[PDB]
Design a protein around this ligand. Sequence first.
Ligand SMILES: Nc1nc2c(ncn2[C@@H]2O[C@H](COP(=O)(O)OP(=O)(O)OP(=O)(O)O)[C@@H](O)[C@H]2O)c(=O)[nH]1
Ligand SMILES: [Mg+2]
Length: 660
Amino acid sequence: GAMIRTVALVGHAGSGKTTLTEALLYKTGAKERRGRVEEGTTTTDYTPEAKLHRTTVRTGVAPLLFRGHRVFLLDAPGYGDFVGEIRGALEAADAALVAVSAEAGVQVGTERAWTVAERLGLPRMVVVTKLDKGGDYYALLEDLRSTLGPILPIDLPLYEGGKWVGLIDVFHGKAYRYENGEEREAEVPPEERERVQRFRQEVLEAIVETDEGLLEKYLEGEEVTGEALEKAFHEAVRRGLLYPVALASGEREIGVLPLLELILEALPSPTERFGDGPPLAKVFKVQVDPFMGQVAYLRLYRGRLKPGDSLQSEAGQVRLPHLYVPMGKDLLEVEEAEAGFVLGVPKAEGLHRGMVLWQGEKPESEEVPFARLPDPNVPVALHPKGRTDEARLGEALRKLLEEDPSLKLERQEETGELLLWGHGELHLATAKERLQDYGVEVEFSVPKVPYRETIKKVAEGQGKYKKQTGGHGQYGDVWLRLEPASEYGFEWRITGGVIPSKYQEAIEEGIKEAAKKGVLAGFPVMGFKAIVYNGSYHEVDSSDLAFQIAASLAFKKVMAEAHPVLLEPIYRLKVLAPQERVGDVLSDLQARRGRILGMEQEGALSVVHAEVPLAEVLEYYKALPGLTGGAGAYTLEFSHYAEVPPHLAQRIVQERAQEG
Ligand SMILES: Nc1nc2c(ncn2[C@@H]2O[C@H](COP(=O)(O)OP(=O)(O)OP(=O)(O)O)[C@@H](O)[C@H]2O)c(=O)[nH]1
Ligand SMILES: [Mg+2]
């Protein structure tokens, strides 16, 4: 009684998560009718991006109430594009419910969520959906055992003439059939009894083996009570030693409430994870929905709260005059919150994702769940469409990054572009759409390549600056030798004190400044050693400015005599692709001026290692799917700069010259 559970519902895209969530909200009476993803009427999927793309872009909270018990279910995204929200939902929960389609089995997205849950130390339960589409549940159980390990079948499917109509609860040897979401007990079919019995024996044995007390009794032949077995089961799941497998479909309305009862029976309470104590909470996500302002979503891990209470935070006291539990986009006021609750805090402009809140002694890192977000690796250059957009862009981006810290916004020092980094093509599309929701039209372009320049031969010469302005003049005289080198180097080789040492810093500054814009095509210059070997000064007119200029003039003159050449960045490209698709991958890489370094095999898959010019793969992320039938994956990492083939170089050099 009064039990509470916090659970993240994760799984590969399209595994039936939101549909199950809708069914749970409907069956518990939280809403009048079960909405549908295909009609845009679900509680979770309410933002324009979620509905347009028919996928959960943003985690939705479903605060389920059932017979006085509460399950705060976090309906999370399926696509890796939304890793931010997925990891945030897992961070916020005490267990993971992993949806697996009976048609597809464990998919890449299933494994990703499973792994994150494992690293967080979270118990896991599997719910098998879509069996109505025709799959083999028994083969799926074997596959789950092979891939995930200690699974524990709770349910087996009840069929009538080949049609899936219900559940056989292995433990109790009872069956239930459904007609229009309504359940009635049925008999376990005669032809199924022996198999059902086998599974029951297997389940009993798996549970007994996890408890020293029960294990002792079984070896001796003593009786094991149902109560003892229930407690052992709960304890084993709590420790991640058994993974219950349930069967339910929100589309066919089969096994929905039984799944909720199993969540309560099998998954841990907040007290079982954190113990009792002072309030401990964390902002696991943030929404800045148009016309709503910033709302911070808080998981209360421990403690209890009443309206008017306050929590400490790195930004000072956070008062909560009103407590609200979120249901999708709605905030429902409550009069108390206990550990396990997820709260929605409105007017939360000062509360950011990842912020820890507490009472008493501040927590250290080991006390707060944390799932690191991998850096976004897909860049696009951002451009406001017009005047109105440029004026509104800064604030819209501020809102976008508050809501989604998995994006990275950076001013590319070298090329001058404003870059937005995301986790995939879909991720970036949803960001563009979100900026549009905020009233700003932006366009994405392929980022400019940071070309550079260097020299091929030694050269030397003079840089001199002498002028008089008013009653004070200027004088700088520098002799500079430039030599090709693997890395930058500055050498002071002044002799006889012809230039005082106090001007060394200014001279190096001037060389570095001129090196920012090479003589070949105006790109930063690298790969040279600069030697200052002679020069002169005048006590009166000499200064740092005169020497910075003289040094810059010397650099420009000398680099031009040093046979300058264009360089481009080269990246290491790893591509994982089906064996039958390898030919297209290589064929295409060859057209991208790629250099195959070698290949490895991972099943019918093969890993292709190559080096390719960054300029040939800035949109590789868009082409990979078509080249690998959607099964491919890739990683790009900077390797080194290399001279641009004479043909390309000329055209690039010409382009830069022609305009600018
Ligand atoms: N036949 C059948 N269809 C289902 C079942 N569950 C869900 N669907 C359908 O599967 C499609 C996707 O369902 P969703 O609930 O959006 O799946 P999801 O896991 O939330 O998807 P993402 O949020 O994109 O990761 C929709 O057409 C649902 O109607 C099921 O058990 N049987
Ligand atoms: Mg969904």
